[PDB]
């Protein structure tokens, strides 16, 4: 009955380039941290819980961390239990790199 069903639902195109610059700028982690903190009452308790969980992660499986940044590991673990694929430890790759190092602007 209300004639706005599709005028407010038409898919915005040209979004593919405004999907990537989020991913190397750390935007996905920044937008995931707040969604994890959307239900917490005291942020300091949440931070302390994250730090303790990361300390446990470092203790149980020591000989893996140094690259994986176990804090990123626990954040990805918490974000991966409600959908939100979030690749392991938010690890970044170089799909097109026949070289050792990017210039990084």
């Amino acid at each position: 009955k209300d004639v706005f069903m599709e005028a407010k639902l038409e898919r915005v195109p040209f979004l593919e380039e405004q999907m990537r610059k989020v991913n190397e700028g750390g935007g996905v982690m920044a937008g995931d941290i707040d969604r994890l903190m959307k239900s917490e009452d005291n942020r300091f308790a949440f931070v302390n819980e994250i730090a303790a969980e990361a300390t446990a992660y470092v203790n149980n499986n020591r000989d893996e961390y140094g690259h994986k940044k176990a804090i990123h590991h626990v954040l990805s673990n918490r974000m991966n239990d409600a959908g939100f694929a979030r690749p392991e430890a938010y690890l970044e790759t170089e799909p097109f790199s026949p070289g050792p190092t990017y210039l990084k602007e």
């Binding site: 639902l9 038409e10 915005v12 989020v22 700028g25 935007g27 920044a30 937008g31 707040d34 969604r35």
Partner: protein, 46 residues
């Protein structure tokens, strides 16, 4: 298609501050951080 206002005037200094405050209260400090990056790039281009 978002919930925004189509500006049709001059966005001066005091209008930019008002717009950022309203985008913060309506979306949060996680969505606004990406807006500010985009507006910085578009502002520098023009």
């Amino acid at each position: 298609r978002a919930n925004l206002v189509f500006h049709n005037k001059a966005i001066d200094g005091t209008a930019m501050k008002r717009l950022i405050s309203r985008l913060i209260d309506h979306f949060g400090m996680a969505y606004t951080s990406h807006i500010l990056d985009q507006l910085k790039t578009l502002g520098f281009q023009q």
